């Protein structure tokens, strides 16, 4: 019935399992030794019997033989079962490509988590109130300080596909990028800057893509004074519901376009996509000039209809 | 309900139990009390049982009464045991550690002191109850109190300690906590931390046995690392217990082989391989001792060397 | 030589100014209680934020010979070190770690020497429980008022000790200077073994009286 | 004569400046916002840290006749007495203890008079539960605008009443002054016994009307 009491009183599950274990061990020692030295049982039997006695089964294969045995056993049982029940309750309490990590929680990471609904996402933030909002978005919550390496390794940073750092300031964003490069110097870090001056410090600390939102926003609120078509183009090609989308198409090896210049290929006339740029590794040539010959490995940045996108992939293929 | 109601009900049943088995079965009190327990315990070992309609009646009645009062008494007991432990976790009394160590104040200096003091009993006396989680994660006991109170310094058992480590927020409270310890026990060892160079002679006159100034040490390693930083590379590496060479100190025993001989005729570096940076007798230290220095008994040789070389030194200085 | 910039004002950058007498110091901090303390210590005061690159160039970081970064937090010390590494990519940065876990991260940011005062004093507090001769040796060889001073003497190119091993020299038996370590480049070998051989450019970390140090500078001369 | 240094600004030191009108008073406090409140009372402000020995010699502790210490805690009040006693070993220090257990620690540090306001308040609180005449006595004889004044009249060398006991002198009938004590050096005998004879240069602490105080000084004159 003590187990009923334990269910009635989970309210007292306040102490370490280590205290619980030491105390139960002391009891089984008392029990086993008395069976060996008072009852005269072997050690195999004394322990067996002690367990059976503590657990309150008492089969009767072994039973106390003397008043001392009876006095001894009464003590053994009355204390042991209480402890046993406690130990059992604590055990029950305990018993019952890759992922991307997001360090911090803000409005930039809430809208990023809408497009990552397929993948596995771990969100590492030290505040406890943001636990409810991560589970609504289908992502696992890891509680800890994101600038700490002892809590970054809890969030599985070492085997991540990419890590996204968006913290409260640029002092903590830099202190978090250098803690990820302490774990591995190969994972992709995508960082966000609050100020325009700290863009080069975030690149020196180790970020691979720095996205400054208030510099884009400040440079769209000065072009929208006359006509707001610049802020209407940027906020439309990024929406996944839109008719035209800005996608990337890689050129495979031995392609029909390798060595062909952009006026010798005529991509927009045949396929129908608009070549706004072409990226070669970690750079990007926007509006490529006349003498730009293609290669196997370049990534083509274009805008077109989805019925025009597959025509571009079926054309440049080897 | 009063705790005494719960207890009296428990007692009433064991009496009932023991007496009825005697009156119905004719069994002795030893077995009657025991059997009652056996049924309450729900174990049933198979020795005693009722053998009459009334005994069976009695026994069933008894079991119901027994378990009911028992279970209540037990849950109260368990609650008391938890409450006592919870108070201990918060911290209240100190269990007479013969050599325990008391740490007055929680900062970043005393946190790296607690990584080297593993195994020994360490009590941490601090005013903020927020740092209760950090202390028990490092294996130290926490005592919630104000360390500048003599009524609260005795709660951490300062009188029986082997050393007290004082690092409070300012130098005003570090002197006040030292002055409070020197009237509780005027013979315990106080290691204290000075934040200003003005107060090093003030902490020492109040009763501190060793005053450590981390802003004067670091302020002198920063002005010496401008040209070449080999002075700060040496200091920060002989204190770490993960390097190759380790700075330890060995004492000179009574009746040794070196009692009376000068340093030059001793050749401690040539035989043993241990660099003897200084020797200390009592409460002073002589760094780079001259060649006419005569060793006496009770000396302490401070040296640097590999742990293979320190054992070679100890057999050479033995009696 | 040249001037020394100090970013941030604390109790350890105040004790550093007592040994920078005879040089030129620019301190970069906040105005509200610091400008009177700095001018009473023989240094200039440049009001600005040391984490901001437009205020680091007012304090003449680009032409300095050492920058000393002691800010309030270990996230603002990192943010100031990466601001120095944009102006001058080669100047010496002596940083200071407030916590032990950030020591490896202040070296990635660009500091050339990371002092850690609370790991040193936390390791001298636990070695003074029995007897405190470890704490009395550190705080004595650094003060310039004592008798024996920890100095460092460089071995010149084409010298009488170049190529000579430490067994063949016995520098303590001839000069009276304890050779507690030999530094080559950016690495230090504390208590070098008997099979070590000197080069041209090694620096000898040693402890001795100023009579003995000048006897060592003539013993390694050619 | 000389000036008075007051360390720390609080409600106890604001009420001390109301009776120190007409003397030079220097107030050494760490807050800058109290510069208007100090200067309004006729006291020259000196901005500094009172627990620092450098900012204690700014306020001219040496040429002072009394130093009144009242800081935010009993730790900083002990630390300030330990700094004045390095500078001036013979100046008079008046200190203010908060706790009862610190009265002997402020007194061993070097304070000549320790006033504990929280113990006098706790004594008069538990003595006003039945009849509050004891609290009304203390807060009336200390007022500067009351009918009776508690004074100190010293015995000059060569006085009429040298050697005379307190019984045969009969001070209360001739003068009117209630004799509630005789001070000899640094001790006070409240309710002196009848066999206690007088001595040269011994103070008589007493209460009386201001027309009765002037009749006492002629009764004890030469």
UniProtKB/Swiss-Prot annotation, chain A:
BP GO terms, sorted: potassium ion transport
PROSITE patterns: RCK_C, RCK_N
Bilayer disposition of the protein: Multi-pass membrane protein
Primary localisation category: membrane
Gene3D superfamilies from the UniProt entry: 1.10.287.70, NAD(P)-binding Rossmann-like Domain (3.40.50.720), Regulator of K+ conductance, C-terminal domain (3.30.70.1450), Voltage-gated potassium channel (1.20.5.870)
GO molecular function: identical protein binding; metal ion binding; monoatomic cation transmembrane transporter activity
Keywords: Calcium, Cell membrane, Ion channel, Ion transport, Membrane, Metal-binding, Potassium, Potassium transport, Transmembrane, Transmembrane helix, Transport
Subunit structure and binding partners: Homotetramer.
Protein name: Calcium-gated potassium channel MthK
Source organism per UniProt: Methanothermobacter thermautotrophicus (strain ATCC 29096 / DSM 1053 / JCM 10044 / NBRC 100330 / Delta H) (Methanobacterium thermoautotrophicum)
Organismal lineage: Archaea, Methanobacteriati, Methanobacteriota, Methanomada group, Methanobacteria
């Amino acid at each position: 019935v003590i187990e009923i009491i334990r269910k009635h009183l989970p309210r007292v599950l306040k102490v370490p399992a280590t205290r619980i274990l030491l105390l139960v061990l002391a009891v089984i020692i008392y029990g086993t030794a008395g069976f060996h030295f008072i009852e005269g049982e072997s050690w195999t039997v004394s322990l067996y019997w002690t367990f059976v006695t503590i657990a309150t089964v008492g089969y009767g294969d072994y039973s106390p033989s003397t008043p001392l045995g009876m006095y001894f056993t009464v003590t053994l049982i009355v204390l042991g079962i209480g402890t046993f029940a406690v130990a059992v309750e604590r055990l029950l309490e305990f018993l019952i490509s890759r992922h991307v990590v997001i360090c911090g929680w803000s409005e930039s990471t809430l809208e990023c988590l809408r497009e990552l609904r397929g993948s596995e996402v771990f969100v590492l933030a030290e505040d406890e109130n943001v636990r409810k909002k991560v589970l609504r978005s289908g992502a696992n919550f890891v509680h800890g300080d994101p600038t700490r390496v002892s809590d970054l390794e809890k969030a599985n940073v070492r085997g991540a596909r990419a890590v996204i750092v968006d913290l409260e300031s640029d002092s903590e964003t830099i202190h978090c990028i250098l803690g990820i490069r302490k774990i591995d110097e190969s994972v992709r870090i995508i960082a966000e800057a609050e100020r325009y001056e700290n863009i080069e410090q975030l690149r020196m600390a180790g970020a691979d893509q720095v996205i400054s939102p208030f510099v884009i926003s400040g440079r769209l609120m000065s072009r929208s004074i006359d006509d707001g078509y610049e802020a209407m183009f940027v906020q439309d090609v990024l929406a996944e519901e839109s008719t035209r989308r800005m996608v990337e198409v890689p050129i495979p090896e031995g392609s029909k376009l390798e060595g062909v210049s952009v006026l010798d290929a005529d991509i927009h006339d045949v396929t129908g996509v608009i070549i706004i740029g072409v990226g070669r590794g970690d750079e990007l040539i926007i509006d490529p000039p006349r003498d730009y010959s293609f290669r196997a490995g370049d990534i083509i940045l274009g805008i077109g209809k989805p019925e025009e996108i597959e025509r571009l992939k079926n054309y440049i293929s080897a």
